[PDB]
From a paper:
Subparticle reconstruction about the I5 vertices improved the resolution of the decameric complex to ∼3.6 Å by the same FSC criteria. Using the molecular modeling software Coot, and guided by secondary structural element predictions from Phyre2 (33), TVV2 CSP residues 37 to 700 were built into a single decamer subunit, denoted capsid shell protein conformer A (CSP-A), nearest the I5 vertex. This A-B pair constitutes the principle icosahedral asymmetric unit (IAU) of the viral capsid, and model quality can be observed based on fit in the cryoEM map. Analysis by the Dali server indicated a root mean square deviation (rmsd) of 1.4 Å calculated between all 664 aligned Cα atoms (Z-score = 47.7) of the pair. Notably, we observe an unwinding of α4 and α15 from CSP-A to CSP-B to accommodate the interface with the adjacent CSP-A subunits. Closer inspection of the decamer model from the outside reveals the residues lysine 157, arginine 159, and asparagine 255 from all 5 CSP-As lining this channel. The channel measures approximately 9.2 Å in diameter nearest the capsid interior, to 12.8 Å near the exterior, and this contrasts with the 16 to 20 Å I5 channel of TVV1 derived from a lower-resolution cryoEM map in a previous investigation. In the TVV2 CSP-A we observe positively charged residues (R74, K523, R525, K539, R646, and R653) arranged on the cleft exterior generating a positively charged region similar to that observed in ScV-L-A.
Clinical Tv isolates are frequently found infected with one or more strain of the double-stranded RNA (dsRNA) Trichomonas vaginalis viruses (TVVs), belonging to the Trichomonasvirus genus within totiviruses. Among totiviruses, the single capsid layer is responsible for protecting and sequestering the viral genome while facilitating RdRp activity and the egression of viral mRNA into the cytosol.
Residue numbers in the entry:
A (entry chain B): 37 to 701
B (entry chain A), C (entry chain A): 37 to 700
Write the structure that this text describes.
């Protein structure tokens, strides 16, 4: 019993959303055109070490409006997307909910492992023949996360070509470092990486690279260690690339923050049937580019075999790991927080029994070889943040404002039309700000911003939907981020810890980036209607739609003429009620003031809004309420013409303007 | 005929309880993080000897809630799950009920030794079957208990690095100890270990170490000793690991207190065809860690062989040997009631015939290889007590009070409808405190609790449950602990002298720990809702249910707002409903303090209680009864909000919340 | 529900496949004729050492056709069936699937040795049944593999007379070899034999040669060793032939590479009632050919006795030991894909108990007595690969290509209807070549291929098929070979450095050799017509079928006339059939080169291909697709002639052409 819900569901059924394969196909293979620090210009030559956490590759995209009837031409705007590309952040949390993390099934690792432990094992420990005690939990997650981090290191070094280079292996290990200095990469204020040169662990009897080793032979003993066990044939253990891959994984695991390092120990250790190949501990210049690449390949093969050859969750965890160092940069001065509350993947210490003999499959294009995986991971994340944006805004702007002496019992005041009763909260400013998990959770549980999310994600990803959905929900539940009174100034990565202040002391907490990108990519988009082609506009009625609780963005008939001469086009007068009583009218802006209008007068000096061109803040709630207005016309015609807007962006996907939406017709 | 019990049984059948194997598997590789003393904090450098009997390994677990559609920030709480770490108690008692202790069948042992004797042409008297049956039955129980005790000593001495350790063996054999000094690993008030260096028995003719030895000679008379006989092949008697294991057990048995060295003699006799290797008592440091590890492995091999290759009863007894060192601590004021009443194991002196020529089953994951055997052993006990709590709190909170005018009036004198009429007991304080056994014995044997406890245990364990049920029934049926009126303060391990009296002098004898742990583990949970995720409270009805005796712990809205609202959201006024004489509404707290409510006032001015976030004492029995009360809200429709709760405990298992319950 | 598969199964059932025995019988007495190097020609005098790893024994086979009613003389072609002769590879891997390796039952061995021990009054411990079951299972697999390797070494050294031979034993024991020199029979780059003279183990107290010896004494303890025990009667331990055989095996086992001497220890222990004869290591020439022949015979007798008198599994393992020297070579450009993926045998270390008092079954025709064991062993492998090829090429040619724009587009991008949609794979060349295992594993496990491969193998072999099926499935499921883009040139044995890229970079991974051999042998043949006798072609329809993707090898008329006509017999013109817009007919070759056909022209000017008489590459996948083409003849009705083909191969068997097929 909800007409809007059923209408939207039927629409989404009519025009299925574009599954992610198109996004991957489009983004996989273009190099960035130019990379520069977010605020300013790049220097002549890049410094020795990435040290300013603002460098961001950007993706230009512009809009030009064009129409006859206006006084002068309209200047073009630059809707460009940015990618953080330097700053670090955590993404792994221990919390969980039912679907947040699942354990794989060792239904094809147990037969072989038992048949290989029954024969080559001293004939005095007894016959095992039970195939039921080999039931340790199967959680091969953290390996993929570390793999992703390693790929991220490689990509970050490639993009920001430093002046004096070093081999990726050399930079990662950091042989020629100082006592407690930062690694060659990731050396800045926010950097979180174990400093100092990496230390090889020890010179024990049974070594097989960085991890422990146990053999199964007659004149020996057998005792499976506690962590994970990767049972492999003697052929590969004595191979070369595999040893290098193990060393690389170990190396990237010891650069995590010390505390998080203690939480999730690197417990891998291999068991086979041949003599232990002593640890090699490469140093100075043993590993080189091609050898590293070969090791990466073999490692990917190993991980795929560990995942029961799933390759869709593998790519998921790999993306999530690579996301600690690449991520989209917000676009609105509000502060770019919608991402910060959706970035956590639950995890558990790795464990289980794994057997690896061959390949069992071949994937045409794995993530680790696609010409800068960082960008593709960042955009793969953005294509989800935008869907979340679309679902939250399904009802209204969902503002959160500040008022002094607000009741510390309930924080729900009605703001007027265009803001549904549920949303539109308020909070005292002089006390610590709210936690921002006290709103989102309340938003994504209702059976209107839930089913939409369900079906949209289902169409985007298909069978491997639940995992993402479940996980993101968990992220929302425990997010410590808080709302703040500051601005990002649109040329920063983080709020400058000075005294930026809000224009209206309020924050809209459901906008992350302009919906135009959502339309272009084909994903779901809401509210705001698309602007790419000829449009019939009726100012005399569009403006009316505005003052009764709209937003200017839908009203592309106004922005065109905002200061091109709208003045001598339309007048506003209080009301001409021919009967009961001649009362006067007024309107309320996003602030509290309720300045009124008494007589006929040109519109240009009653509202007088800032003119950006044809790209205004979509959820700014310019006017909340207004009663008693007429909007007379002051020119025959000249208020029922045409307008043409052209937007060309480099990320136009395959099915660009054929996606579901429910913006006013 | 009872409907509630039928409903509970049906629900339990439909939703099976979690198998024990998951709980075992999820602890094998748990790394502890806190080893602080229970009360204070770790000193800079660890001592040289385990003296303060207050240390505890703390399994931290955090819960924090949030008020959806509000700007309030409730501080996060802490589920402090404490495991006692240095304190000695006894879990052995020679008193058994019919099913308590079984007799492992010697079906596969007698024929092998018969054939051995026949092959080596030894002249024995009488068919070995009847002589085995009457002369020596087959009870190997003891030899597993000592093994568990040894593992526990190792684990204890490992976790608490005493600033200059020696070895497992050097702190066990008491080399360089004064004749009155206590062993290094256990030196504190009221310990349970004999002191001074242990003395090896005199070297007689034939010895296989610390126990007698008898060799079987061709064409020569053979007569068995009186204890237990462990026939072995000659290849093993000359092994170093075997003798080292034997020595370690002998040492562990001569360290338990003096009086139990004359009731459970460690009698054993190795029999083989070798030449008596003679005892080679290790004297100086000569038992290195790898040698001790090999000793433990071979020992577990022999033990598992003796138990007819069962590995389940063996695991049970090995664990029961460990609680003598590692115990699960209580989480309430008047604790040490459930654990103190379920620890004993019925036992018989070690005797019978055994045979070990080679191992047959390869146990993949024995106890002693876990990350820390103490923790694994303690958690299983915790599960047992959790289920026992679940069954006990099936029909109320089971209060016991100390009212001076106890004789003048009968029971149900003070406890209104809250405490189910039939589960409240009183006793005048002139006499000493009663014996807890009296109450628990009557509690357990009611058909309603029996028929459910049996099913729960059977689901948890399976074919091996009956031993555990019988043993716990015996233990609870045999307990000397008294319900002492004093308090524990929840910041100690042993009750300190001079502690203050309990709250209202009413001990509650069901609680041992919060049920959230039981929910997380996926085991049977009592009638408490699981604070897991999104909740939709309604403060009016919720509050009304409280004043009918219900537990505040089932009221989420109140706990969330305990000090952040409820002074501007809800009021209390007397009911003026009919035209009859107006009456002053009143409600009765636990101690019989009838409280009158004459003039309507904000709730926070009529009733109070400490704010523990959302973790309040489950069965605190706050309001016994109330009559004539009304609750009206004074907020413009924002008294029906939503809350979110997150419980990220580190001991969550596979069956997260799939376990049965009473009030879903 | 699948009709094609049902038809194939019905046809296979109606026409049984040839039993393996005929193939074995038709090779026992085959005399090879050519021993030239694969590439060049035999030098005047043979070398003194086997170095060039390119020699091959060539089984020549000739086919020549004739155009009935014509004066043309097509030159005779040559089915070059090459058998690699000096090249070492490994066919051992410790990785098994459930049916891969069985455990021969010790039903008839334990009782005999039990009775022997009882008769000789030896004091043993424990009934031998359970000790056999747990302490030592019965896997004699290894000792047959070494025997096969020894036979193979003999055969290799025999065929290639190295201009001054010494003996089987003098080239095996490495007498007079430098500490770095390699053994005479195997001295070349990337060999697989340990170098230098082999060193005898030290002479201890009791030895029956190169292995330990234990005698059973009346009224004396007896304890078995840890490896395998081979009880024998005293009459044999003192025999010369037995010890010579034992020495030969020991020598062969110490010559295989160093790293497999520590994973498959040659552990054995003779047990008897004699006096330890002591090791008598032959040192100078003292193993004459007749003595070695006797050694081999007695050895095969003992082996057959150990295998429960099976002689089928024994033959299989003996053969599998030989391919390590003799392999069947490929007959295509991108070969070494099928044989490289089906060679491994799952194995377990040698152990258990055995008993040999006298032979019981007299195998008439053992392997080692054949004219040349290498050839006989290689041919059986060839049969296995032939059947495997037959099953693989059941639904198309299974192409794999290297297109740079692989990611941008999905599969079926280039391969028209010719390559069954679902059997074409691509990969960008930026990454290294994929693993062949990935493709083959998916190929084999489809139900359609499984249900036919099983039946084919069962018909060929019988009760012993399941071992072979399981072992081949394991091997193919475990292969490290990569699909390297390079070419082989068909005039070598090992891929030479610097060879040119493949044709269109598209490897085809079904072909191993021409199906005419499979037809002749009477085994299952893929969907290729057998060019046997009189044929009645019709060039028009035949040519039309080609341009629908069919294989040119099924078009006899075209191949016969490839360069003798088809420039004056048939023309190609665009189809002008309807009144719609005329369109330029086009056809697409393998590499996606769309070819337009605008003006009608003689066929030889539109399409070309090399003339190999009538033996063209079977699955070359010439024309993927074509649309809008017409074929009209310009000869006065002499385009429907007859042809004759004669295939007088020297390895024809009884079931000449009675085997099943797909397109009869």
């Amino acid at each position: 019993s909800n007409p809007r819900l059923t209408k939207v569901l039927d629409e989404m059924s009519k025009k299925p959303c574009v599954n992610i394969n198109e996004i991957r196909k489009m983004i996989r293979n273009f190099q960035p055109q130019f990379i520069q620090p977010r605020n300013g210009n790049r220097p002549n030559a890049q410094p020795r070490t990435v040290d300013s956490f603002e460098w961001v590759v950007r993706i230009q995209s512009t809009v030009e409006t064009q129409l006859l009837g206006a006084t002068n031409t309209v200047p073009q705007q630059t809707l460009n997307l940015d990618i953080s590309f330097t700053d670090d952040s955590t993404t792994i949390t221990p919390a969980s909910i039912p679907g947040s993390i699942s354990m794989l099934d060792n239904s094809r690792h147990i037969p072989a492992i038992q048949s290989m432990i029954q024969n080559f094992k001293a004939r005095y420990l007894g016959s095992l023949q039970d195939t039921a005690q080999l039931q340790s939990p199967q959680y091969p997650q953290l390996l993929a996360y570390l793999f992703g981090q390693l790929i991220a290191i490689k990509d970050r070094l490639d993009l920001f070509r430093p002046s004096n280079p070093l081999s990726l292996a050399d930079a990662l290990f950091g042989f020629t470092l100082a006592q407690n200095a930062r690694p060659r990469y990731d050396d800045h204020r926010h950097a979180k990486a174990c400093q100092g040169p990496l230390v090889i662990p020890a010179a024990t009897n049974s070594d097989c690279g960085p991890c422990g080793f146990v053999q199964i032979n007659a004149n020996q003993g057998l005792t499976l260690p506690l962590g994970a066990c990767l049972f492999v044939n003697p052929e590969t253990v004595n191979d070369q690339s595999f040893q290098d891959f193990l060393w690389l994984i170990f190396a990237t695991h010891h650069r995590m923050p010390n505390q998080m390092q203690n939480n999730w120990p690197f417990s891998l250790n291999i068991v086979s049937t041949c003599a232990a190949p002593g640890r090699q501990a490469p140093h100075a210049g043993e590993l080189t580019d091609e050898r590293v690449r070969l090791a990466l390949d073999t490692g990917h093969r190993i991980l795929l075999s560990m995942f029961n050859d799933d390759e869709e969750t593998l790519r998921y965890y790999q993306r999530k790991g690579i996301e600690t160092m690449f991520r989209p940069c917000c676009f609105y001065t509000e502060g770019g927080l919608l991402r910060k509350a959706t970035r956590y993947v639950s995890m558990v210490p790795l464990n289980g029994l794994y057997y690896y003999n061959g390949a069992t499959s071949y994937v045409v294009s794995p993530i680790h070889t696609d010409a800068h995986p960082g960008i593709t991971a960042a955009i793969e994340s953005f294509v989800d943040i935008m869907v979340l944006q679309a679902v939250f805004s399904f009802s209204g702007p969902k503002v959160v404002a500040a008022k002094v002496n607000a009741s510390q019992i309930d924080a729900a005041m009605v703001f007027g039309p265009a803001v549904a009763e549920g949303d539109g909260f308020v909070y005292d400013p002089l006390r610590p700000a709210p936690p921002l998990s006290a709103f989102y959770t309340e938003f994504i549980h209702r059976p209107a911003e839930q089913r939409i999310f369900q079906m949209a994600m289902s169409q985007i990803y298909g069978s491997h939907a639940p995992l993402i959905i479940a996980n993101v929900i968990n992220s929302i539940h425990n997010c410590k981020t808080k709302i703040v009174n500051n601005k990002l100034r649109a040329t920063f990565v983080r709020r400058p810890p000075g005294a930026p202040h809000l224009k209206a002391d309020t924050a809209i907490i459901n906008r992350f980036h302009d919906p135009e990108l959502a339309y272009a990519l084909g994903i779901l988009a809401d509210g705001i209607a698309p602007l790419d082609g000829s449009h019939e506009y009726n100012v005399l009625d569009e403006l009316d739609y505005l003052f009764n609780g709209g937003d200017i963005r839908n009203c592309f008939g106004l922005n065109a003429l905002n200061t091109r001469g709208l003045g001598q086009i339309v007048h506003i007068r209080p009301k001409r009620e021919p009967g009961k009583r001649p009362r006067r009218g007024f309107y309320t802006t996003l602030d509290g003031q309720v300045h009124p209008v008494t007589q006929d007068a040109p519109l240009d000096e009653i509202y007088h809004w800032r003119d950006h061109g044809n790209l205004t803040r979509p959820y700014s709630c310019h006017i909340l309420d207004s009663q008693g207005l007429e909007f007379a016309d002051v020119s025959n015609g000249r208020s029922r013409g045409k307008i043409l807007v052209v937007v060309n962006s480099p990320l136009k996907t395959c099915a660009a303007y054929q996606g579901p939406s429910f913006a006013p017709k």
